[PDB]
Symmetry: C2
Subunit: 181 residues, 2 copies
């Protein structure tokens, strides 16, 4: 796999985000040279934050219409997710504190977990994952604020009611962390 | 409540399809127009292989040009075995992908969930599986087929877990599987 030589980068779409067709030569371990041609969709990077309450034993999530989901088996298009946004010229922590105010709370301490490529087959997207405590100290649209029992959130992963990658990632992390114990 | 598709413009269509979708969303009050790009690459399946005797997992590593252009210096990415459904049912797809990529003929598998991975503008839903493997189930060396160039990694499960902390594993579905396995006590 070793040797990579970029050959061409053709822009297929420059509408708003960018779709590329990238051609590169890849030398396999047997020494054979294969030319790959691969579509790469660049819609930028993102941050997401699970909000939790240790005293109430609750999490706060958001529900909104996701058109990409609506065209692919999600009947209503509505999706339950952790608060998230695009890193829009902002550092991850700056982006996410701002998204926490807008979507849901002006949180205090956040904890960063990891930064993960969510769909590396054909999408550049890297997501910065955070958790943070919320209270009624730190306090009507298409974006519905959901406050639910953590035990309920876990159950909705089992039934399929919560079926978003980053959200399940975050809820599983909280489960194992002991912050809700 | 109500969603109405207004226009679906095809921005690109070679194998996969990029859309620009205009739709009208109705609120509680009762209409707002939105326009969003939607990238349709199809759905896929992924599997984490584990060995309770050896306490090992099997993962793969291959060049991902999409990570290369965005922070991943070498472009090499450690992931769980995965592929696109390409009109097979998820379990059919995944046993096929597992023997091609890892060399293992898997026995019984466990379905975990099916998750949208990047729902901001990608349709992709991934079917998640795990399966126990045995050394006597290795039929070949794996490595993929056609133009695939895949390195097969068998490693201590405790080692793959700490690679999540060090960033040596930085793939969403793979961390999801590894964390699911840890919570399961199957490797205890
Ligand atoms: Cl209506
Ligand atoms: Cl089990
Ligand atoms: Mg958002
Ligand atoms: Mg694959
Ligand atoms: Mg494959």
């Amino acid at each position: 796999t070793q040797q990579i030589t970029l050959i061409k980068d053709k822009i297929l779409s420059d509408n708003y985000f960018t779709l590329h067709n990238i051609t590169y030569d890849l030398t396999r371990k047997d020494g054979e040279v294969i030319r790959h041609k691969r579509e790469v969709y660049d819609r930028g990077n993102g941050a997401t934050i699970l909000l939790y309450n240790t005293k109430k034993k609750t999490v706060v999530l958001i529900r909104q219409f996701r058109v990409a989901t609506w065209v692919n088996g999600n009947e209503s298009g509505q999706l339950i997710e952790s608060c998230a946004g695009l890193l829009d010229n902002d550092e991850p922590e700056v982006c996410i504190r701002k998204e926490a105010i807008e979507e849901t709370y002006e949180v205090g301490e956040v904890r960063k977990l990891f930064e993960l490529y969510m769909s590396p087959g054909g999408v550049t997207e890297l997501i910065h994952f955070f958790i943070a405590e919320y209270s009624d100290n730190q306090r009507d649209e298409a974006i519905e604020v959901l406050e639910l029992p953590f035990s309920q959130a876990l159950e909705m992963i089992k039934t399929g009611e919560i079926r978003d990658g980053k959200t399940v990632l975050l809820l599983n992390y909280l489960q194992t962390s002991h912050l809700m114990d």
